[PDB]
Amino acid sequence: DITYRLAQKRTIVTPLPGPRSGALAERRRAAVSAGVGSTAPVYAVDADGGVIVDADGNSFIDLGAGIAVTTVGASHPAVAAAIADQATHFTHTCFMVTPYEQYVQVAELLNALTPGDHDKRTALFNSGAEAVENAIKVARLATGRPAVVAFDNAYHGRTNLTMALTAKSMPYKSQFGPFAPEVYRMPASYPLRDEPGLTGEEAARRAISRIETQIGAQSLAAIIIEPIQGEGGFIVPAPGFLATLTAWASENGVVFIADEVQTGFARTGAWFASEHEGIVPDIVTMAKGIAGGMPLSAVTGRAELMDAVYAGGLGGTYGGNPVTCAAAVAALGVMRELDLPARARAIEASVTSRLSALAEEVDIIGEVRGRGAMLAIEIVKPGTLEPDAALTKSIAAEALSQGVLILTCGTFGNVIRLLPPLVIGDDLLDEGITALSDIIRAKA
Template sequence: MTVQTSGPAPLPQSRHLATAIPGPRSEALHAERRAQVTDGFGIALPVFVERADGGILADVDGNRLIDFASGIAVTSIGASHPRVRERVAAQLERFTHTCFMVTEYESFTQVARWLNEHTPGDFEKRTALFSTGAEAVENAVKIARSATGRPKVLVFDEAYHGRSLLTMAMTAKENPYRLNFGPFPAEIVRAASANPLRPGAGTSTAGTNNDGGAVSGADVTTAALASVEATLAEHGADAFAAMVIEPIQGEGGFVVPAPGFLKGLRDIADRHGIVLVIDEIQAGMGRTGTLFASEHEGVAGDITLSAKALAGGLPLSAVTGRADLMNAVHAGGLGGTYAGNPLACEAALAVFEAFEDGSLLANARSIEAAAREVLEPLATETDVVADFRGRGAMLALEFADRDTLAPRADLAKEISARCHAQGVLTLTCGTHGNVIRLLPPLVIGHELLRDGLAVLRQAILDVAAEAGARTAEASAPALA
């Protein structure tokens, strides 16, 4: 049987504005959305997409937008990768669903095999597949509790782990994720993270230590790890089943932990018999220039979580971990009706094929090099860019007043809006909402990337200049 998957001609990989953003057709469809869909769903840009390909989103008004979001790190190999289309179309001809807990299919096992072979950790592994990232996090907690017989879970400042009730308890940001949704599950304990720009316990203010000197990465790591130990001691270290950490904190602001923090957590977990769960849901699957972001730190979790880019846009998540932990759960204790859906499994196998030659990982590193060249100088060229950070194609700019580091969410919002008006899709994030994050697809072309970066850079320069002018005007002495 031959499956036709050629599809329409590729989209031109160039930015094009046919109308204002959003255009009239998008505005009409957005009005219909408001009439039909709960207001509980937010929206970054009210544009209705008709097609997507490579680094371009084409909307219903004929505009072509540069995609610096990738569906929040999901379409890393592009939103219409030909191999994903081929595999999913072929599976669609066979069957769409049987439920792996009822009757089995080989693609589920093949996905598990690949993850067991490629996830960090020199030990025998097993994998369980689910549908969403939050589902993976919750099942990791279930597995850790089953294996250890302990109840508590340690999480960290600036963490984001999902929108389900348990993962909301594990998430740090109150608004919009936790607001009005409590009470939350108990036995979740939060500890300090190792944010190099905004150090937590053991330092007085961000950027300076208690003696007024600059805080080094080693200082931040030492203080944060001491805080973790103190938190465990306060709550009883032998009561903790798991500690769950993102190797780069996503929604919290794309925070790259100070050097040695993850290794220190690995040591603490080993000393206390705690399961170290590394949440690679956003940072994994090649996003940072390695298959998994924890590889940059030379650390392997006892359990590693994957989702988002795992299946090229189809819902799939995975919990991969030490065989003894994963097999500690009784038969029937894990599962889900849609867990490891066969269409999603085929898409994941296509994603794995796309990574085979190493070019996508190289592209991620090239994206970082280009973005650093264009954007990193803004930290000294303006008074509002407090930090440029990230790895690979997971990058961010944090906006704050230079002297006080007071967060400037207003500037991040305005800069992002100006990018949107010029046909460049950017997203904001961060505990204070003052971070613009960049998540371009790993297949984005060099010229398209450069175009988007130039638009973003100019928006930052313009907004910074206007903010500086307002500050100068406000501080000028009144005329007699």
Template sequence: MSLEQKRILATSIPGPISVQMQERRKQVVSAGVGTTLPVFIDRAHGAILKDVDGNQFIDMGSGIGVVTIGHTNEKVVAAVQEQVAKLTHTLFTVAPYEPYVRVAELITKHAPGNFAKKAAFFNSGAEAVENAVKIARKATGRTEIAVFDHAYHGRTNLTMSMNFKAHPYGTGFGPLAGSVHHTPMSYPFRDSEGLTGEEAATRAITYLEKRVGAGQLAAVFIEPIQGEGGFIVPAPGFLRTLSAWCRANGIVMVADEVQSGIARTGKWFASEWEEGFEPDLITVAKGIAGGMPLSGVVGRAEIMDAAHAGGLGGTFGGSPTAVAAGVAVLEQIEEGGWLERALEIGELLTSKLTALQAQYPIIGDVRGKGAMIAIEFVEAGTKTPNSKAVEELVKHCHSNGVLILNAGTYNNVIRFLPPLAITNELLEDALEVLAAGLAKL
């Protein structure tokens, strides 16, 4: 599993073998399955991706936040190897197995909230969100769902309706699901100057009360730090005020932590950054199982138990191999060191990126928590989104051995989601490549 933790450019990007493989891909893979970095990865370990041509890339995206504790983490690999040799499938709702229970014990133990909790497991983040909708509707007897501007929740029919940005996720795929209502988000960089979190929450609440009616809402879904929207961190007080309103009106408060949870921000869950915010349900996926397909819903026991037997599940949901990987990930985080490392990464990234912001006025905002940091690009001296700069920087970084990801409603954000196993040397190398790209613009 070892791989030198070093950026290496052995060929041009993409290399000749990757080019050949792309031609094979075009013949048999749907054009709807796009590619960000046009190389084929052969191996990975820690924070390094090695392609079929021998190039090594610094991974600043972690598979969009999936391999949080690093590629091919030794304990995750060992857990998967052991489990796959023992049992690969029964379906937990037919004949259960212990690792499913163990991962539920771990996730309920560390989810925020001073109340009894239960969990259920599925395959993808979108599937977790859909099941949270089902649970909330069954628990409340209501139908309507509220979501926020700039949100992203998935690519299924229902979750496409919950997304803010239509393209590319929903273009041409309608009609989409109904009973979903969008309300204004707290976006400190773009909100009116001086708008507090409480004021932004009041704006959202007023809209929902007038447009939908509190008594009609089953749940309010929010990402404590928005992912695809550009790592938007709401102003302090926003989440707490929303939560209090939901509690007063019998509405289930759901935190979508598919991207922000599982040690990514320096806490088990990003929800913990807002004092007094205790969501009723939390959706998880991505970083929970080190690259294996596992997602879940965790929350108040009485709400989770509202669903009737057989109402939750799915053929591969919480598969033996995936939950074994989940146990290996969560037990390592529990052992310590990972939350602290996320905070260290955040400090290093924020310091370096803030220095670049002072040098380059096209960087309008640096934001995020822990190892979930983003920079928003604007036309210099304005807040006009600058997507062209992001496009050029992404190309520059990719051609120089650094995998970075764009984001944002206006496609003008670069997000950093490095594995927590990354070294400071690799982080600084990646940022030097970014700085060189900025100098070229």
């Protein structure tokens, strides 16, 4: 039993964008860099439960959660109350100047929540990119080795190094280099497009062989991978792939970094997606869902790695902001109290079965995949695995016109993803999935 602040309804009753959104768009185009861009042409005034309400009073079904961020809802009252309260005491002291309990609380929670029973420590930053940057810093300093491996279909951020680590050039990297050195890309696992029948273990062995031939373990500080590749297309590795990699890394003194920026915090039907794989990452990176929408990120890793860095080596002015920490303590509480991991598993069950039935009735769905509330359909030309990015975009755009916000992704631009807030109601989620299904049938 969840109580909502806003009516959980889809309501589209003006042109899109409406008049007030249009006036805002004119101001936006006059003031904001064209390099930014936005998926939706409407401007938000409220977001609660499973809806976004725009400046003209339209109410959209939110199947994006701000790209997997507002897992607890975009204005959860406990999160809002924690934010307001902390801000009355202090917005900022800089933890590296005058520390505070809120940062310590978050570190404690994350140390306990991440995989493994071993001794761990945490450092907090603002963005997921900063978390990745700092995990790489820890691995390089602790091992004394220079190279880092990242994978095909990877996405890790928009800083120079996280661009280096990211696989796709457009729109993340193109014209923004040259890039941070000693980053090597390897093949990972992509079941749909890899050789038929390839096992996870064999996919891992092929990557290991390439690493040994082309880099050498003695020069490799770290392997970084997303347990489910997010922007690359919600790619779930073949069973056995990740465990095979982690075993090799452990044998070779290489730090294994699981990038759980998108998969972390209930999203995949577990606290962390690494749990489904049985792996215990040496370092985990986190952001998005952590703080109920506020800018917080985290690096949680084996104590001996995290404490290898000299005092002052991990830094930043804002990181572990006390208001964002208060938001995180509250958001993590909500996840526990409402058992949002269980809710994600319920969503996997109901949505995957609907999408699988839809795939049998049309010919444009190449695969239904994902876990928990991180689910996707890959869109292809009938009778092939040829990507159809144009159709993907058209489906997403038609859904928006019908009042349902659905994101896309993928190395080839042809994946419709589903990232609802986990506090969405059954009826509104069903309405959104039905609207999408009708659009897919119409296109097929």
